[PDB]
Amino acid sequence: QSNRELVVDFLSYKLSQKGYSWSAVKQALREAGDEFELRYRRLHITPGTAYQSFEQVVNELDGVNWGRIVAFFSFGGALCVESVDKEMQVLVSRIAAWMATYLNDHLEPWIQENGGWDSVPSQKTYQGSYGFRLGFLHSGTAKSVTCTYSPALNKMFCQLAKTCPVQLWVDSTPPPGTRVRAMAIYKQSQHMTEVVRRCPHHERCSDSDGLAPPQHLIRVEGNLRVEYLDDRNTFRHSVVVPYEPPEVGSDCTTIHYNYMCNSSCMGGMNRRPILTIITLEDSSGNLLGRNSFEVRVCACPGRDRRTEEENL
Ligand SMILES: [Zn+2]
């Protein structure tokens, strides 16, 4: 229980390589941890679903060898960095605690027996040089609310075709010509290759604003400069608007998104969970920053969020 020095130092080292401070046989793990990274690749994380993502990934890697321990320590390193990227700093100390309770029960008893000292759009969060973060109104879960967001799940519940305000926060103002793109993908791995689109009923219902194509799940409300993309090679849908600096006195910019199809719609999402990816891009289309959040479109956003959070 004092291998804590290994976890508390190895993770703080991977935070050093990215610019974060924590706030013998130590060298040995960093070289392997590093040497494993340049030769590798390397699953969503929320403050509530945090221990779940640790039970799953660590149990899924089937005889413990000297190679998986690096792969496990290195796994906890990316987790703490991505947790801070997602503006979820709280999980860093929690991850070290879980990294201290798995090796103590499952992984070490193998080491004392040895004792030797020698197609799919990515969803990784990047805040980028402009400090790009997402903000949400804290609207509670009373039965009458159009849209609500759950921080414990980083999940937004909204009613169909209702204003979903999403805030863009930046440390510095991106140059003119900057654009903001929204895109939905399926959350589960088995469906991530499938394009999220509207179901036949809502696709052919008289709801068009005259700007969005009838097959697009996500629309932007109140913006004549809105642009809709059906990708030439991935066939994925996205919607982009020009970024505007915050209003007079404000310090965030608010896009009004609409979700035009319900989560349980047969022929569409068919009760499958989706994520919405917001990217900041310049005029030439280079990526400046990316954040994502799960979305569910339902009839009563209030009751569904409270029902989900009461499970935590
Ligand atoms: Zn539908």
Numbering used by the authors: 3 to 25, 45 to 63, 72 to 90, 93 to 149, 162 to 355
Paper text:
The tumor suppressor p53 plays central roles in regulating cell-cycle arrest, DNA repair, and apoptosis in the response to cellular stress. BCL-2 and BCL-xL are anti-apoptotic members of BCL-2 family, which inhibit apoptosis by directly engaging the effector proteins BAK and BAX, or sequestering pro-apoptotic BH3-only members. P53 has been reported to directly interact with and antagonize BCL-2 and BCL-xL, thereby leading to effector activation and ultimately apoptosis. The DNA-binding domain of p53 mediates its interactions with BCL-xL and BCL-2 at a surface outside the hydrophobic groove for BH3 peptide binding.
Using this strategy, we determined the crystal structure of the fusion protein at a 2.5 Å resolution in the P 21 space group. In the structure, an asymmetric unit comprises two BCL-xL and two p53-DBD molecules. The two p53 molecules (molecules A and B) contact each other and form a groove. One BCL-xL molecule (molecule C) inserts deep into the groove, and interacts with both p53 molecules. However, the other BCL-xL molecule (molecule D) sits outside the groove, and interacts with the p53 molecules to a much lesser extent. The structure of BCL-xL/p53 complex shows that the two p53-DBD molecules dimerize through an interface of approximately 900 Å2. In our structure, the p53-DBD dimer covers an interface of approximately 1600 Å2 with BCL-xL-C. This BCL-xL binding interface comprises residues from the N-terminal loop, β1 and β10 of p53-A, and from the helix 2, β10 and loop3 of p53-B. Tyr22 and Asp156 of BCL-xL contact with Arg248 of p53-B through a hydrogen bond and a salt bridge contact, respectively. Most of the residues that were predicted to interact with p53 in the structural model indeed binds p53 in our structure. It is worth noting that a region of BCL-xL (amino acids 99-111) has poor electron density in BCL-xL-C, although this region has clear electron density in BCL-xL-D, suggesting that this region becomes flexible upon p53 binding. More importantly, although mutations at p53 dimer interface, such as Y107A and H178A, are not located at the p53/BCL-xL interfaces, they still disrupt the interaction, indicating that the formation of p53 dimer is important for the interaction between p53 and BCL-xL.
